[PDB]
């Protein structure tokens, strides 16, 4: 009974042609799992091609083939056979039947004993590659990622071998982690993800009520909310963070109403993994651990904005204290640099005080690293280097001393971010330097030094060196340039023509730079620089909460310890919540919410 | 009306950041040149002449530290061009995103 | 809407009536087939339509776009590179670059099979550009 | 798109070779068998592969495929 005849029979779909197969299999002691019947290049079995070729609903050759497998005594059944390639490893026929959207074949395969925890862990099924599909590794994850709620409901609630929601793949991801990983912030994708997420949570409340599905961490240590915060998936992070359920599963909410009087109400938000009191929070991950381009859009969301504004309003005296200490330090730097040359003792005290302040700032910035932090690092490094060369009397200390003086007075613009009006202005300064200035300066220096070499070789004292002709040409861009008809020179008209062409080309280049900045500024969302400034302020408030480098600071927890309801296991659940008041003048059309308190307080 | 709105909004924060830039380079040039730059109050005037268009940059043969003075002047010219360009781009941001009936 | 519907109907009727002959292979007196005349003239809508074309089961051999496999949401599509690839003489790419006097040639470069084929050809030749 | 056309003209001139030494050029794509002709033969065509992701696939009808499983 040949292999190709077996594949042609199971692809055709007639069960009667599979006659005499079991009697042939009995005498030769060969099994359908054996390597003569697999492809060998991939390990593909005849049941897999029976499921790949289906009828209108379901092929009719599967169950007689599985009966023939049961008839002979096979220690390894055919329904649990996996692929063996490096590309497509661990894939089984239950995955194929779930992929083909076919519920009757899934019922049939589980009904004959298929493993519902087989992991499709080959290379095609891995995370970040070219032309792959990462859904998790499990059949329940494949059913949830492809919008098949009937297959999900069967795999959870079948009589024999139920699938576990707590089960997790090689990366430690459950089904909720995998639903975070497939989000792309499109409309249809988000509508799939939030609906399947809530359905899985409610089914876990029904099936396994004692376990918390969202507390389970991955192998990196992340829960679904922190993975959503790290990955930068805004649609599901916003949805999870303000979540309201109904009466039988109301303990799975993260948003509550404390009281409601007319149009005013007070809402409560759960601060479980959000508040920066605890280790490895959502705020620290948005600020410090996410490499997404849109972190500043995630700061602006609804519970986070008011929590950060409250944390900022407490820490304004510490911000003003740090500003005054840095400004006193720079006044001492200036008085020590201006008097370099009763007095010598004051100068010695000034030099030692500048060395201690430089070592202080350098240790603080290195403790940070273990745009603006780079500049504070460079100032501190050059200050310590200048004072170490001042101790040895190397006499080349004075350029480094005055260079670090200029950088310290410029680094004073870090503190402009305390106000909105100056903070957005300095955000724009950084964006003008790091984007628009450098390619201007590239094309300009290529234009400058070509004309410089041309004028030196043509004038051979107007232009003696390359380095002096480039200075005389730069004076044109300032406004101090000297163009005259040179009577002394042999080649007078050509020098005059080269100067006139230089002036025209640099006017064209400056005009292009200005027009490119208008192209960037007219085509822009106005909220974006505001939100970049908000993220600057959030990073500042988290570093001020962490404390200084020598003295760690004991930090208070935010919120209020408030009793929300009862757990399914007969206890009250007290949660730390953040209060946000609201006004709504269209309340009276909508239905009234359930409240914790009868009257305001 | 536009003259008042340009003075009371756009000019003062430009002038804040500009004076912080001006006097840092002034102190640096006086302490490095120790007669090109004798006092703080005269070096700040010589640096303000660059913003007008009358600034004098030359390779100072007399000074001990010649290349560093030249590099500090070139960096000053670049930073003030960046600041003026930012002021202009912020006024275009305020003027393109506005209702025309409001000044009326 | 007239041109693409009448074009497909004429192709299917040629499949029914004279199946051995290829209607789109016949050249003009300049040496251009319909796709190259569309590329030269700068007619974007019909050039885009011809370049990614899918028919149904009785005339499926007249397509220029195919599906190799499909698994859930991911799929791999196939595009015919008959007169497009610059390996052969007088291609669509050489005509858009060198023989068309249309003002909007740069809009025809951005279309869906052409953009990725040009990005692949650029990614191979970066060492020669740096050399 | 004007920059893209500049890049396309550059890549075609670099494929043509230098002026003294013409360059033997490779054909792009993959020689893949698509179906059968009306005159009882298979038609092999050179094709270019482009991958796609679509999260609204399940409302639409399924396409006809060349391969049963990915590769
Ligand atoms: C890291 C970069 C890109 C940088 C390092 C130094 C060399 C710098 O020259 C530049 C570019 C440059 C290159 C050559 C000639 C002139 C300018 O700009 C900054 C850099 C640009 C200036 C302007 O400073 C700012 O950007 C404003 C600012 C400072 C500190 C902040 O913490 C800050 O946060 C908002 C903003 C400061 C200098 O350190 C300075 O005062 C001196 C003497 C030169 C400046 O290079």
TrEMBL record, chain A:
It comes from the Eukaryota. ANK repeats lie at residues 89-121, 220-243. GO terms for biological process: calcium ion import across plasma membrane; positive regulation of axon extension; positive regulation of calcium ion import; positive regulation of cold-induced thermogenesis; response to temperature stimulus. It catalyses: Ca(2+)(in) = Ca(2+)(out). It is found in: Cell membrane. One of its GO terms (cellular component) is cell surface. Its main location: membrane. GO terms for molecular function: calcium channel activity; identical protein binding. The keyword Cell division does not apply. It comes from Oryctolagus cuniculus. This is Transient receptor potential cation channel subfamily V member 2. The keyword Lipoprotein does not apply. Residues 319-526 form the Ion transport domain.
């Amino acid at each position: 009974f040949d292999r190709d005849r077996l594949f042609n029979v199971v692809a055709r779909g007639n069960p009667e042609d599979l006659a005499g197969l079991l009697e042939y299999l009995r005498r030769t002691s060969k099994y359908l799992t054996d390597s003569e019947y697999t492809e060998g290049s991939t390990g593909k079995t005849c049941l897999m091609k029976a499921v790949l070729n289906l009828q209108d609903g379901v092929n009719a050759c599967i169950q007689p083939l599985l009966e023939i497998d049961r008839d002979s005594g096979n220690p390894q059944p055919l329904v649990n056979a996996q692929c063996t390639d490096e590309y497509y490893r661990g894939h089984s026929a239950l995955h194929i039947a779930i992929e083909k959207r076919s519920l009757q074949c899934v019922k049939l395969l589980v009904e004959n004993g298929a493993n519902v925890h087989a992991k499709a862990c080959g290379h095609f099924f891995q995370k970040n590659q070219d032309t792959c599909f990462y859904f998790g590794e499990l059949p329940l994850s494949l059913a949830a990622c492809t919008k098949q709620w009937d297959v999900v409901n069967y795999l959870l609630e079948n009589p024999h071998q139920p699938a576990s929601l707590q089960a997790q793949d090689s990366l430690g991801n459950t089904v909720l982690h995998a639903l975070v990983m497939i989000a792309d912030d499109s409309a249809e994708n988000s509508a799939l993800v939030v609906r399947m997420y809530d359905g899985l949570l409610q089914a876990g409340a029904r099936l396994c009520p004692n376990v918390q599905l969202e507390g389970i961490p991955n192998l990196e240590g992340l829960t679904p909310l922190k993975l959503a915060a790290k990955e930068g998936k805004i649609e599901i992070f916003k949805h999870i963070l303000q979540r309201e359920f109904s009466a039988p599963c109301q303990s799975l909410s993260r948003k509550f109403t404390e009281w409601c009087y007319g149009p005013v109400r007070v809402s409560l938000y759960d601060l479980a993994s959000v508040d920066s009191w605890e280790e490895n929070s959502v705020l620290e991950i948005i600020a410090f651990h996410s490499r997404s381009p849109h972190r500043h859009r995630m700061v602006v969301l609804e519970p986070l904005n008011k929590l950060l504004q409250a944390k900022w309003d407490r820490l304004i005296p510490r911000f003003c204290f740090n500003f005054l200490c840095y400004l006193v330090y720079m006044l001492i730097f200036t008085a020590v640099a201006y008097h370099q040359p009763a007095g010598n003792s004051m100068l010695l005290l000034g030099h030692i005080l500048i060395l201690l302040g430089g070592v202080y700032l350098l240790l603080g910035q290195l403790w940070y690293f273990w745009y603006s932090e780079i500049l504070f690092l460079l100032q501190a490094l050059l200050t310590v280097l200048s004072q170490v060369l001042c101790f040895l009397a190397i006499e080349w200390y004075l350029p480094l001393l005055v260079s670090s003086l200029a950088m310290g007075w410029t680094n004073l613009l870090y503190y402009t971010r305390g106000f909105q009006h100056t903070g957005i202005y300095s955000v724009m300064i950084e964006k003008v330097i790091l984007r628009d200035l450098l390619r201007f300066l590239l094309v300009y220096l290529v234009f400058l030094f070509g004309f410089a070499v041309a004028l030196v070789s043509l004038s051979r004292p107007p232009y003696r060196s390359i380095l002096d002709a480039s200075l005389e040409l730069f004076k044109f861009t300032i406004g101090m340039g000297e163009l005259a008809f040179q009577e002394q020179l042999r080649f007078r008209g050509v020098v005059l023509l080269l100067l006139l062409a230089y002036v025209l080309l640099t006017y064209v280049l400056l005009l292009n730079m200005l027009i490119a900045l208008m192209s960037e500024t007219v085509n822009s969302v106005a909220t974006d620089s505001w939100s970049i400034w908000k993220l600057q302020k959030a990073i500042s408030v988290l570093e001020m909460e962490n404390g200084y480098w020598w003295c760690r600071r004991k930090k208070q927890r935010a919120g209020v310890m408030l009793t929300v309801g009862t757990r399914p296991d007969g206890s009250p659940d007290e949660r730390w919540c953040f209060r946000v008041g609201e006004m709504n003048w269209a309340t009276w059309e909508q239905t009234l919410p359930r409240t914790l308190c009868e009257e305001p307080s």
